[PDB]
Symmetry: C5
Subunit: 103 residues, 5 copies
Amino acid sequence: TPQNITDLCAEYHNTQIHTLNDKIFSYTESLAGKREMAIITFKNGATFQVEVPGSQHIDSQKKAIERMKDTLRIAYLTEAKVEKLCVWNNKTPHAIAAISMAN
Amino acid sequence: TPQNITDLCAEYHNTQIHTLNDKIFSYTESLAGKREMAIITFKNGATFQVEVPGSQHIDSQKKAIERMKDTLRIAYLTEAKVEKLCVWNNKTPHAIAAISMAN
Amino acid sequence: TPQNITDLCAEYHNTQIHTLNDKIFSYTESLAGKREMAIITFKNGATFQVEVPGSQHIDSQKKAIERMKDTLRIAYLTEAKVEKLCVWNNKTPHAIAAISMAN
Amino acid sequence: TPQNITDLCAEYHNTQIHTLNDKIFSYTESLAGKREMAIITFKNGATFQVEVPGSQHIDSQKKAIERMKDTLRIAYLTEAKVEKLCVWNNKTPHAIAAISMAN
Amino acid sequence: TPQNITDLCAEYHNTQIHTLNDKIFSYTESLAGKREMAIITFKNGATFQVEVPGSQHIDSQKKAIERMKDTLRIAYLTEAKVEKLCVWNNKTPHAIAAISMAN
Ligand SMILES: CC(=O)N[C@@H]1[C@@H](O[C@@H]2O[C@@H](C)[C@@H](O)[C@@H](O)[C@@H]2O)[C@H](O[C@@H]2O[C@H](CO)[C@H](O)[C@H](O)[C@H]2O[C@@H]2O[C@@H](C)[C@@H](O)[C@@H](O)[C@@H]2O)[C@@H](CO)O[C@@H]1O
Ligand SMILES: CC(=O)N[C@@H]1[C@@H](O[C@@H]2O[C@@H](C)[C@@H](O)[C@@H](O)[C@@H]2O)[C@H](O[C@@H]2O[C@H](CO)[C@H](O)[C@H](O)[C@H]2O[C@@H]2O[C@@H](C)[C@@H](O)[C@@H](O)[C@@H]2O)[C@@H](CO)O[C@@H]1O
Ligand SMILES: CC(=O)N[C@@H]1[C@@H](O[C@@H]2O[C@@H](C)[C@@H](O)[C@@H](O)[C@@H]2O)[C@H](O[C@@H]2O[C@H](CO)[C@H](O)[C@H](O)[C@H]2O[C@@H]2O[C@@H](C)[C@@H](O)[C@@H](O)[C@@H]2O)[C@@H](CO)O[C@@H]1O
Ligand SMILES: CC(=O)N[C@@H]1[C@@H](O[C@@H]2O[C@@H](C)[C@@H](O)[C@@H](O)[C@@H]2O)[C@H](O[C@@H]2O[C@H](CO)[C@H](O)[C@H](O)[C@H]2O[C@@H]2O[C@@H](C)[C@@H](O)[C@@H](O)[C@@H]2O)[C@@H](CO)O[C@@H]1O
Ligand SMILES: CC(=O)N[C@@H]1[C@@H](O[C@@H]2O[C@@H](C)[C@@H](O)[C@@H](O)[C@@H]2O)[C@H](O[C@@H]2O[C@H](CO)[C@H](O)[C@H](O)[C@H]2O[C@@H]2O[C@@H](C)[C@@H](O)[C@@H](O)[C@@H]2O)[C@@H](CO)O[C@@H]1O
Ligand SMILES: OC[C@H]1O[C@@H](O)[C@H](O)[C@@H](O)[C@H]1O
Ligand SMILES: OC[C@H]1O[C@@H](O)[C@H](O)[C@@H](O)[C@H]1O
Ligand SMILES: OC[C@H]1O[C@@H](O)[C@H](O)[C@@H](O)[C@H]1O
Ligand SMILES: OC[C@H]1O[C@@H](O)[C@H](O)[C@@H](O)[C@H]1O
Ligand SMILES: OC[C@H]1O[C@@H](O)[C@H](O)[C@@H](O)[C@H]1O
Ligand SMILES: [Ca+2]
Ligand SMILES: [Ca+2]
Ligand SMILES: [Ca+2]
Ligand SMILES: [Ca+2]
Ligand SMILES: [Ca+2]
Ligand SMILES: [Ca+2]
Ligand SMILES: [Ca+2]
Ligand SMILES: [Ca+2]
Ligand SMILES: [Ca+2]
Ligand SMILES: [Ca+2]
């Protein structure tokens, strides 16, 4: 089991770490059918999604997808500094796998 | 996959973007039967619903509807600035499909 | 579809609007069997319940009942001003159907 | 239907009211098997639990037990004043049945 | 039933109490498949996980695992002082069983 986000991220293909060290600039949320997702941006233009749940996701990920959207909303609203995101870079926008906050 | 609320909104018929750049003026919530909904207003009188769940919604939308009501309540209580809403304009009041927050 | 609490409240028998324009004075919560409910008061002694879920409620109301208790707790803890309550006045204490928050 | 915590408490056997009029001093939470519970204390050493869900509970209490743990956590973090607890005094520590928050 | 985290912790094999008396320094969570988990650190380098749910857990632990991650996120965001953690020391990083918060 990994001890940090960087090591975690390295366990998977198709991923990378972004080091933001910044608060979330915007938070977008949709309930529209087939677009039940969240999008965040940072001041530098970096844009990330929490993907629409699909066949790329196993059943054990479903609660964690919902948690992640909860986390991004409250991080946005508290201006919490995001340290890193682990993302899948085979999606556009890049798709969030993990987040770390330290500040 | 869209990267922002404007492009997301354009994927659908009967939708329009409202650009508010303002906090929510009022938040209303009902548990009464057949009116299990939320209503928000802005100071300019713009009025929006989160629809009662119904046969227009697919299963994947049901958690998202609940999330959106959570988001609107906490946005209201934090006086968070709402940037845009994507709404269905074939409902009265207009029905929320997506929200963006930026400030 | 209604656009405000007053019009929503008027769709139901045995209801009334209370105009409070005040924060919640006390919040009570019970997990005791057959009394799984919330009670709120205002400074003037006005007392309201969220009813114990029962056969008077249709299935769609169940989630809305839980939401309303969440809303009352966070409204209490943020000292949010309650504008109006729509209540059923054939219950003692009067039972909450809807809430509006504004200044 | 009762209108306050005192009257509610008096509907049950083996209960008593504690009048605390104080914030929660400590909040403890366990996920250990058969000990999935919360424990609070006050500065005077008064110690209370939210019981592990068990055969003493009816099904309608299950959501309310979860809600109570939610309430205690946020009350602790907001330094909210606890007015009274209704507890079962046939449990060690005394088991929470209901809570009131006020000044 | 135990009355404090130390006594609870002692009911289990392979556990120990860490006394931190400090805020959480970093919070990490993941939605990646098979790593649906959270990791926290303290300034002294102490690193702890909330384990991925698995066959080592009983059903009552499922909700408690989700609660614990909720608690760690809000404790982080409120800078709440963590008093003690009860952890399993047969996992790397040590796995959280219980948390206490106090000053
Ligand atoms: C179009 C937009 O909204 N933003 C782009 C930004 O891309 C977005 O954010 C990235 C992280 C990714 O999720 C994209 O899918 C998304 O549209 C661009 O970022 C570059 O993205 C490419 C992938 O298109 C590579 O990943 C590259 O490393 C990224 O550029 C870096 O990150 C940027 C935020 C800047 O810091 C840039 O200087 C870096 O080179 C950028 C490219 O300028 O343009 C908009 O911001
Ligand atoms: C309670 C009320 O009557 N308020 C009106 C407002 O209507 C309400 O809000 C809109 C957004 C919609 O949901 C209505 O169903 C609801 O009653 C009026 O809004 C205009 O309505 C039309 C047709 O519905 C369009 O939606 C239009 O975009 C709305 O105007 C926009 O919002 C206004 C508040 C202005 O900022 C205007 O420039 C925008 O285009 C408006 C105007 O008639 O007046 C009250 O606010
Ligand atoms: C704890 C207490 O005795 N408070 C009373 C309040 O009664 C409570 O709150 C009302 C809304 C209801 O849920 C009652 O069952 C509950 O005990 C009194 O409110 C009046 O209550 C009588 C019934 O005993 C009638 O329901 C009457 O309509 C209520 O008054 C209206 O609402 C008040 C809060 C004010 O807006 C008043 O001007 C209204 O006419 C009130 C008033 O007697 O006194 C304490 O607050
Ligand atoms: C950790 C500890 O020993 N604290 C005690 C407290 O006991 C704890 O809190 C009470 C409410 C109950 O949940 C206990 O199981 C728990 O250990 C003591 O309270 C008394 O506890 C004894 C058992 O030792 C009896 O249960 C008794 O009823 C409790 O006293 C009542 O509650 C107190 C908080 C006071 O209001 C007292 O007047 C009440 O009768 C107290 C009492 O000495 O001391 C520490 O806080
Ligand atoms: C490597 C790193 O990131 N941190 C180490 C820390 O280990 C981490 O945290 C501990 C609690 C455990 O979860 C590890 O798996 C994890 O990598 C080290 O902590 C000691 O780790 C050993 C066995 O690895 C024991 O768990 C021991 O209790 C730990 O030491 C206690 O906690 C420390 C932070 C110190 O305060 C120490 O005095 C305590 O005994 C420490 C070694 O000090 O170093 C990094 O922080
Ligand atoms: O679990 C989610 C992930 O699934 C992978 O198969 C896919 O390559 C990633 O882009 C991401 O969607
Ligand atoms: O998914 C929800 C949407 O469903 C559409 O069919 C409908 O026209 C919209 O008004 C909205 O209700
Ligand atoms: O939805 C529940 C409501 O149902 C009505 O039939 C009843 O008269 C109200 O008091 C309220 O309980
Ligand atoms: O509903 C919970 C309560 O049920 C009672 O029967 C029991 O005596 C109490 O100690 C408490 O557990
Ligand atoms: O309940 C969770 C615990 O289960 C035990 O059997 C295991 O030894 C611990 O490491 C921990 O996983
Ligand atoms: Ca700021
Ligand atoms: Ca800080
Ligand atoms: Ca203000
Ligand atoms: Ca305000
Ligand atoms: Ca701000
Ligand atoms: Ca105040
Ligand atoms: Ca206060
Ligand atoms: Ca303080
Ligand atoms: Ca404090
Ligand atoms: Ca600080």
